[PDB]
């Protein structure tokens, strides 16, 4: 049993007609101190999988090392490592899920919330969540921490049920997701304005966008607000 | 806790109460009478917290006697019990509540019927053919549920109690030093000085 120290906030994601999108800001908080700003919390694995991690950063870095090893190990005595026997997103996930549950069962968890996004070899979209308790679930949209409360409601307005997936384009989806990141910067006190976004499309492959920024914010109306009730100036 | 038992038969109410008073490691007295006569036809038994128990009983006694003098009349059993319930229901929400449970057995001279009332320290009141407080009910209620009859004679009530006391003296961990039994009927309240072997 431990307690997180340096932490990463929300991880939001959703699936569209041809793939899945996933994003996370670049902050590593230390309590109320927004200590580290160049933290990448999106871990690509191969070219069909991206693992988004929130929670304790030291554990994230540990999950990172585990993922690199999975790749190395899979290559060993595997003439099809970059073909029929390459790592599928579901393999990556089942592995992590397994570890998360073993660690909670030993009363020494990896203090994180994880979203594994990607495209299976047969084109299927893959989006599943696993956390420090070893709990797992899937939904057309998935978010961790704060984004669970504020992002999911927005993203679900685009893809409310399975049948909405084929009707959602990369444009619409990336837009929903970019807007959600802005909303989170508005109401989540542990968020950063900079973030990374990644798309895994069954046709265009993996697109990893770094150094994005929340833009087009509304703050002007702030000037019209004074006092807290009766004050006039 | 102490033993507080009550049984309402055809023409009277019988109350049995343990005689022991234990303070920690020792039994200080084995002849304690845990009862107070509220009026010629109303008797109240009680069990609970050390000092509160008697202070409450005597306080109630005082008030009923005062009412009897003022009105030159004896309040019905039902009336005396409602008064007592209210006193406890007040106490339950006061600074330091009275931790006392009581059984009120009386003979209603106007209705010509005996009545048994059970009221715990919270002011919970119920009228029953027989009742008890504490653990006592746990050992005796199955015996009373079995042998009880509305037309029982006072003699049959005493035999049924004796049976209850024997069960208590067999399965209950504590030595309550026997009980003192009192009968309340149309002619008042009398004590059965012979139960040590009836």
């Amino acid at each position: 049993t431990q307690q997180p120290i340096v932490t990463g906030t929300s991880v939001i994601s959703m699936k569209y007609d041809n793939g899945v999108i996933i994003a996370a800001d670049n902050l590593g908080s230390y309590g109320s101190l927004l200590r580290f700003n160049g933290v990448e919390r999106l871990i690509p694995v191969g070219d069909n999988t991206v693992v988004g991690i929130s929670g304790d950063i030291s554990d994230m870095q540990h999950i990172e090392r585990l993922l690199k090893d999975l790749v190395t190990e899979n290559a060993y005595d595997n003439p099809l490592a970059d073909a029929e026997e390459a790592l599928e997103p579901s393999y990556i996930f089942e592995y992590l899920a397994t570890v998360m549950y073993q660690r909670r069962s030993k009363m020494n968890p990896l203090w994180n919330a994880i979203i594994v996004a990607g495209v299976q070899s047969n084109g299927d979209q893959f989006l599943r969540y696993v956390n420090l308790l070893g709990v797992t679930y899937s939904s057309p949209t998935l978010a961790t921490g704060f984004g669970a409360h504020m992002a999911n409601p927005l993203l679900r307005k685009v893809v409310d049920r399975e049948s909405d997936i084929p009707k959602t384009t990369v444009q619409v989806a990336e837009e929903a997701i970019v807007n959600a990141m802005r909303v989170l910067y508005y109401r989540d006190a542990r968020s950063s304005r900079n973030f990374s976004l990644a798309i895994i499309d069954k046709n265009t492959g993996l697109t990893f966008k770094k150094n994005l920024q929340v833009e087009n914010m509304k703050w002007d109306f702030a000037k019209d607000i004074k006092g807290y009730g009766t004050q006039k100036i | 806790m102490d033993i507080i038992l009550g049984i309402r038969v055809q023409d009277s109410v019988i109350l049995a109460s343990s005689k022991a008073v234990t303070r920690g490691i020792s039994v200080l007295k084995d002849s304690d009478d845990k009862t107070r006569q509220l009026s010629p036809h109303t008797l109240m038994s009680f069990a609970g917290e050390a000092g509160d128990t008697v202070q409450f009983a005597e306080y109630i006694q005082a008030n009923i006697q005062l009412y009897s003098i003022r009105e030159d009349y004896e309040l019905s059993p039902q009336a005396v019990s409602s008064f007592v319930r209210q006193e406890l229901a007040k106490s339950i929400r006061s600074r330091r509540p009275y931790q006392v449970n009581v059984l009120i057995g009386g003979y209603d001279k106007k209705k010509n019927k005996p009545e048994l009332y059970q009221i715990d320290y919270l002011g919970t009141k119920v009228e029953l053919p027989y009742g008890a407080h504490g653990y006592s009910g746990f050992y005796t209620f199955s015996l009373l549920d079995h042998h009880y009859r509305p037309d029982m004679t006072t003699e049959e009530g005493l035999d049924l109690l004796k049976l209850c006391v024997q069960e208590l003296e067999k399965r209950m961990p504590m030595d309550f030093k026997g009980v003192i039994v009192k009968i309340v009927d149309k002619d008042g309240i009398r004590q059965v000085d012979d139960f040590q072997a009836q």
Binding site: S32, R190, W219, A222 | -
Partner: protein, 196 residues
């Protein structure tokens, strides 16, 4: 919360972030922590929003009645009323207050009332969670008798840094200028102070 008051050549300026939180949630991102207790006597509020509001509302009431009987109150007197309320009720309050006022005889003045209810008159003062991060910056960049433009700049930079490091601070930077000329309201948005 990040709030500060700075005296300068022509008077004094108040500044603050516009964030109120309930845990990690931002309950209000456009809060106005700069409260008026008199025409030229304002305060900066940190700590409990409920406590500081109740305190301020009462000080304003007290100063209104004071004015009705003895004329305009000195900044020192306003700070004294705040102090009275904070010290005497220290057990039930969580209020960090900075009082700032402009007098014609005294010019600008700043009194800081920290948690225990003590009073401290200073050339400038900072407070709130975000302040801890700008102690060094402010101590190195503050100068007495700065111009209005320089002072606005000092506050803008100081607070943007406090907002930068403190998750408990954010939104816009509000300022209130108190000089003989009157009362001026200033606001600065993210896109401006973040890249300073």
């Amino acid at each position: 919360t990040s709030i500060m008051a700075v005296t300068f050549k022509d008077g004094v300026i108040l500044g603050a972030d516009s964030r109120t939180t309930t845990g990690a949630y931002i309950a209000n991102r456009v809060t106005d922590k700069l409260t008026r207790v008199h025409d030229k006597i304002w305060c900066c509020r940190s700590g409990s929003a409920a406590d500081t509001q109740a305190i301020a509302d009462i000080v304003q009431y007290h100063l209104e009645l004071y004015t009705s009987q003895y004329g305009t109150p000195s900044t020192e007197t306003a700070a004294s009323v705040f102090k009275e309320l904070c010290y005497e009720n220290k057990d039930n309050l969580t209020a960090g207050i900075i009082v700032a006022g402009y007098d014609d005889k005294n010019k600008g003045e700043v009194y800081t009332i920290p948690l225990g209810g003590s009073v401290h008159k200073l050339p400038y003062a900072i407070a709130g969670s975000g302040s801890t991060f700008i102690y060094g910056y402010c101590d190195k960049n503050f100068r007495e008798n700065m111009s209005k433009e320089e002072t606005v700049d000092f506050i803008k930079h100081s607070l943007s840094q406090a907002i930068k490091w403190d998750g408990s601070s954010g939104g816009v930077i509000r300022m209130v200028v108190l000089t003989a000329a009157g009362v001026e309201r200033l606001i600065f948005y993210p896109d401006e102070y973040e890249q300073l």
